[PDB]
Motif scaffolding. Structure first.
Motif, PDB file in Angstrom:
ATOM      1  N   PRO A 177       0.826  -1.211   0.000  1.00  0.00           N
ATOM      2  CA  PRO A 177       0.000   0.000   0.000  1.00  0.00           C
ATOM      3  C   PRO A 177       0.857   1.257   0.000  1.00  0.00           C
ATOM      4  O   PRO A 177       1.906   1.318   0.643  1.00  0.00           O
ATOM      5  CB  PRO A 177      -0.811  -0.131   1.291  1.00  0.00           C
TER       6      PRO A 177
ATOM      7  N   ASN B  63       0.723   5.840  -1.105  1.00  0.00           N
ATOM      8  CA  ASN B  63      -0.012   7.040  -1.461  1.00  0.00           C
ATOM      9  C   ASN B  63       0.435   7.524  -2.837  1.00  0.00           C
ATOM     10  O   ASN B  63       1.345   6.970  -3.456  1.00  0.00           O
ATOM     11  CB  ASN B  63       0.182   8.120  -0.397  1.00  0.00           C
TER      12      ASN B  63
ATOM     13  N   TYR C 175      -6.104  -2.573   3.237  1.00  0.00           N
ATOM     14  CA  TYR C 175      -5.566  -1.269   2.883  1.00  0.00           C
ATOM     15  C   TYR C 175      -6.708  -0.347   2.483  1.00  0.00           C
ATOM     16  O   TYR C 175      -7.833  -0.787   2.236  1.00  0.00           O
ATOM     17  CB  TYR C 175      -4.543  -1.387   1.747  1.00  0.00           C
TER      18      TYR C 175
ATOM     19  N   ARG D  64      -7.003   3.613   0.113  1.00  0.00           N
ATOM     20  CA  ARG D  64      -6.313   4.650  -0.640  1.00  0.00           C
ATOM     21  C   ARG D  64      -6.842   6.043  -0.334  1.00  0.00           C
ATOM     22  O   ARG D  64      -6.467   6.999  -1.016  1.00  0.00           O
ATOM     23  CB  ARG D  64      -6.415   4.368  -2.139  1.00  0.00           C
TER      24      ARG D  64
END
Lengths: 50, 50
Positions: free
Chosen positions: A23, A25, B47, B49
């Motif tokens: 994961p 950004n 996860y 986002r």
């Protein structure tokens, strides 16, 4: 005759990663100023540190 | 057997014994899952986002 159009460099809309990804950004045209996702060691099957 | 034995002991017939004639009572079924099945050894990662 003279060749006017014989193929050429072709643009691709998107690339597709064939490897599993952790994961993350946004780090492209959009950059996320927040902290990266925190990875926590949870759901341990056997007891440790307790 | 008749003259040299004095006392005898009797018990109910054990259920484990089975005559040869009744061999079809030993027929039984066992099921093995399909070999196409794949058992996961990898944990799930959660996860977001956002």
């Amino acid at each position: 005759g003279e060749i006017i159009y014989d193929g050429g460099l072709s643009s691709k809309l998107a690339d597709v990663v064939d490897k599993t990804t952790e994961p993350h950004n946004a780090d492209g045209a959009v950059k996320d100023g927040r902290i990266a996702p925190v990875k926590l060691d949870l759901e341990k099957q056997k007891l440790d540190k307790l | 057997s008749k003259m040299n034995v004095s006392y005898r002991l009797y018990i109910k017939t054990p259920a484990c014994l089975l005559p040869l004639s009744d061999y079809m009572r030993a027929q039984h079924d066992y099921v093995s899952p399909s070999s196409s099945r794949v058992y996961i050894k990898d944990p799930a990662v959660v996860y977001t986002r956002s």
